Amino acid sequence: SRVAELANAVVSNADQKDLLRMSWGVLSVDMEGTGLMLMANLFKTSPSAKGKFARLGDVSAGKDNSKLRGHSITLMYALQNFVDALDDVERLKCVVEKFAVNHINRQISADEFGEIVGPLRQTLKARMGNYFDEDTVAAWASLVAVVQAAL
Amino acid sequence: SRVAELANAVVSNADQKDLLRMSWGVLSVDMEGTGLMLMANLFKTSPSAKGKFARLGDVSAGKDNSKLRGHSITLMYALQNFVDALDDVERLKCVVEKFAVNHINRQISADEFGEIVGPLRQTLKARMGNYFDEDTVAAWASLVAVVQAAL
Amino acid sequence: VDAAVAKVCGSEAIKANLRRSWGVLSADIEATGLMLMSNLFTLRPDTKTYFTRLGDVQKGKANSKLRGHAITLTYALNNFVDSLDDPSRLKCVVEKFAVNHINRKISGDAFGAIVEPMKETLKARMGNYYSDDVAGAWAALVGVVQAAL
Amino acid sequence: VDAAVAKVCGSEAIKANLRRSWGVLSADIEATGLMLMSNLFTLRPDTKTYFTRLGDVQKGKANSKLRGHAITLTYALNNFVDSLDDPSRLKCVVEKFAVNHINRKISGDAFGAIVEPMKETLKARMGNYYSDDVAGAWAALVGVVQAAL
Ligand code: HEM
Numbered sequence: 001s002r003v004a005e006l007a008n009a010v011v012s013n014a015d016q017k018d019l020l021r022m023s024w025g026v027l028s029v030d031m032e033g034t035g036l037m038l039m040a041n042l043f044k045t046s047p048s049a050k051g052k053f054a055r056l057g058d059v060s061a062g063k064d065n066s067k068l069r070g071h072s073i074t075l076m077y078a079l080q081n082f083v084d085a086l087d088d089v090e091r092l093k094c095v096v097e098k099f100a101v102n103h104i105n106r107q108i109s110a111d112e113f114g115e116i117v118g119p120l121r122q123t124l125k126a127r128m129g130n131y132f133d134e135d136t137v138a139a140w141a142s143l144v145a146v147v148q149a150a151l
Numbered sequence: 152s153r154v155a156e157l158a159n160a161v162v163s164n165a166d167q168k169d170l171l172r173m174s175w176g177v178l179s180v181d182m183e184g185t186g187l188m189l190m191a192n193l194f195k196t197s198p199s200a201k202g203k204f205a206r207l208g209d210v211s212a213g214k215d216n217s218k219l220r221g222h223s224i225t226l227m228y229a230l231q232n233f234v235d236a237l238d239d240v241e242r243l244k245c246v247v248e249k250f251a252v253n254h255i256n257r258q259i260s261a262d263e264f265g266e267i268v269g270p271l272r273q274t275l276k277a278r279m280g281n282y283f284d285e286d287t288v289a290a291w292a293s294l295v296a297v298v299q300a301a302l
Numbered sequence: 303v304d305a306a307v308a309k310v311c312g313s314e315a316i317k318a319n320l321r322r323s324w325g326v327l328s329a330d331i332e333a334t335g336l337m338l339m340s341n342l343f344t345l346r347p348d349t350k351t352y353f354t355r356l357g358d359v360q361k362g363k364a365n366s367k368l369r370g371h372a373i374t375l376t377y378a379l380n381n382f383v384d385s386l387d388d389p390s391r392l393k394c395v396v397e398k399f400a401v402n403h404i405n406r407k408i409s410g411d412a413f414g415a416i417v418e419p420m421k422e423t424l425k426a427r428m429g430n431y432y433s434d435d436v437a438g439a440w441a442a443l444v445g446v447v448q449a450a451l
Numbered sequence: 452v453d454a455a456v457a458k459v460c461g462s463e464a465i466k467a468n469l470r471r472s473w474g475v476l477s478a479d480i481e482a483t484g485l486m487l488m489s490n491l492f493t494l495r496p497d498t499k500t501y502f503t504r505l506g507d508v509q510k511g512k513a514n515s516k517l518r519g520h521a522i523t524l525t526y527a528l529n530n531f532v533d534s535l536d537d538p539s540r541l542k543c544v545v546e547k548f549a550v551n552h553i554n555r556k557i558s559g560d561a562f563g564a565i566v567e568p569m570k571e572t573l574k575a576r577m578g579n580y581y582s583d584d585v586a587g588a589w590a591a592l593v594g595v596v597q598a599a600l
């Protein structure tokens with residue numbers, strides 16, 4: 001697999017790390033709200049994803065759906081985990097591998113997992129406003145690609 | 152060359168980072184109190200330090216001396232600075248070099264700078280309680296030694 | 303679950319003690335997780351057989367699957383602590399967490415094996431800032447998960 | 452100085468704004484410091500003259516002396532934020548940092564050069580969570596130092 005290669009490449013790329021941490025500083029202000037936003041956007045641009053999340057019930061109901069809420073919050077702590085791993089290759093690798101197993105068990109493939117990038121962009125536009133920059137999206141895409149490699 | 156060697160060794164030593172961060176969890180609960188304790192211990196074991204810290208006035212007054220409080224608090228953020236630099240060699244080196252410049256300006260020799268280790272040990276023992284260990288002292292001493300190589 | 307949540311969220315003291323202890327643990331999230339798991343398997347080796355995917359769990363940080371698990375577990379604690387001001391949030395986070403453990407055949411009684419390991423972890427990491435009320439706070443929080451299982 | 456301290460410590464709105472903005476900035480202490488210094492020299496190029504020990508301050512992270520400075524500056528901000536519960540702490544911390552700037556012949560007016568640079572740094576790093584009151588909070592904190600200079 002390319003997990004080791006891509007994990008090493010992310011940890012050694014100071015440019016990208018800066019963009020990840022700066023934007024995470026904004027995304028993490030409201031963990032629940034931002035998690036729910038990411039998921040809302042996912043379901044809007046990948047309607048095929050809705051069925052995969054059937055355990056959650058009405059995935060369009062946002063904060064009024066307790067299971068979607070718990071899911072969306074927990075998703076944001078997975079991203080916090082990744083962000084806190086950006087200075088240690090073997091740490092990043094092992095947490096990526098952990099979450100890959102979670103997704104493998106739901107038959108989520110690499111390109112399926114990639115469907116989060118558009119949602120991340122829309123969420124970054126909402127959260128960054130006039131300071132939005134596409135280079136940050138590319139930074140998140142690079143991190144997402146480490147997980148994709150593990151799937 | 153020597154600062155680089157020692158800084159690279161700190162960044163490469165994972166076990167030592169664990170000891171630094173664990174002990175930091177206790178030292179940083181009460182930054183002000185811990186700083187004052189560290190300084191009190193320094194003045195106890197180094198008579199000469201009182202003279203070098205002449206700006207601070209009557210250091211025997213401890214927490215009731217405002218200049219000593221301001222100093223002691225800032226000292227603790229300098230230790231936070233070290234703790235936050237353990238995964239980035241160029242970061243650690245620039246932090247150390249800045250510390251060295253400041254202490255050179257205040258006529259502090261390498262031997263004088265090393266007077267902090269005993270005080271740290273006593274402070275660590277006061278805070279770590281039944282879970283003090285000698286190895287944690289050596290971990291802090293490694294950081295002190297990088298600065299000593301620069302002085 | 304609602305009543306167990308309220309025992310925690312309705313107590314200023316429990317919330318304060320969870321928050322201050324979490325402050326200490328958060329100085330090293332990875333080491334917290336590894337120590338908690340080490341204490342679990344040392345104090346309660348009977349629980350080792352629940353962990354069939356993680357290889358040799360006694361190998362600690364060198365076992366990458368255990369390491370990834372231990373780190374991630376500590377972010378679950380982070381999430382619980384960050385949920386204290388909103389009972390409905392703590393509820394939905396714990397309910398999700400409970401599904402994960404039910405899927406691994408963990409009962410409430412089994413989950414309670416963590417209490418003494420947690421107390422030891424708290425004592426070791428907090429030094430002279432430990433008090434028994436801190437252990438009480440974490441036992442109450444573990445009780446929320448037990449109520450959900 | 453006392454009046455300026457009371458304006459900060461006595462206002463829950465200022466304290467809450469300093470704390471929530473610091474929450475964001477602390478996601479990357481080093482990057483915050485480097486961005487603040489970049490904005491200082493960009494929005495107030497007249498201030499470059501004071502920082503010639505640091506060499507080419509325009510080089511950012513690659514300039515190790517600038518980097519070391521920027522990191523230390525950001526921990527000074529961290530210190531201010533942790534001084535909000537005790538007006539006497541804030542006073543003595545401000546007085547300490549004032550001593551340093553007095554000795555570099557930095558006047559109150561000169562020190563105030565940081566305010567617009569800080570405002571732009573806050574906008575850039577907080578995104579939609581920025582508010583004018585956040586900049587006001589930081590200006591009030593800078594005002595304490597200005598009163599001491
Ligand atoms: C940044 C991107 C993503 C992160 C960090 C992430 C993280 C997570 C986490 C932590 C869980 C809970 C795992 C468990 O408890 O077993 C989860 C569940 C899940 N994820 Fe993701 N995920 C991401 C993107 C996606 C995408 C794009 C899809 C599909 C299009 C996906 C499909 C799923 C499914 C089906 C579940 C199980 C839901 C359930 O029934 O509870 N994930 N994800």
Ligand code: HEM
Binds near residue numbers: 222254263
């Ligand atoms: C871990 C060890 C140490 C660290 C990280 C450290 C860090 C610092 C810092 C950050 C300052 C404030 C600098 C400024 O604002 O200009 C300072 C001031 C000072 N330090 Fe240290 N220091 C350490 C050990 C020592 C020791 C052992 C001595 C003397 C025996 C010493 C003597 C001084 C003096 C004389 C000042 C100036 C105090 C004043 O008048 O404000 N330092 N130190």
Ligand code: HEM
Binds near residue numbers: 355374375403406
């Ligand atoms: C404070 C206490 C605990 C926390 C915060 C915790 C948290 C977690 C988390 C977040 C996961 C990953 C869930 C997933 O991705 O599917 C997990 C997995 C697991 N937990 Fe716990 N747990 C705790 C105590 C226990 C105890 C006491 C047991 C057994 C008696 C237990 C048995 C398991 C098992 C078997 C897994 C699956 C491991 C795997 O293969 O990934 N947990 N735990």
Ligand code: HEM
Binds near residue numbers: 253498524548
């Ligand atoms: C919030 C605003 C500011 C804070 C908290 C601050 C804090 C500091 C700190 C902590 C140091 C390093 C002291 C040490 O050596 O340990 C420093 C150095 C310095 N500051 Fe500031 N400062 C601020 C704004 C300014 C501004 C606006 C100027 C000039 C217009 C200024 C001029 C300097 C100079 C000349 C030095 C010495 C740099 C060197 O040669 O190493 N500061 N400041």
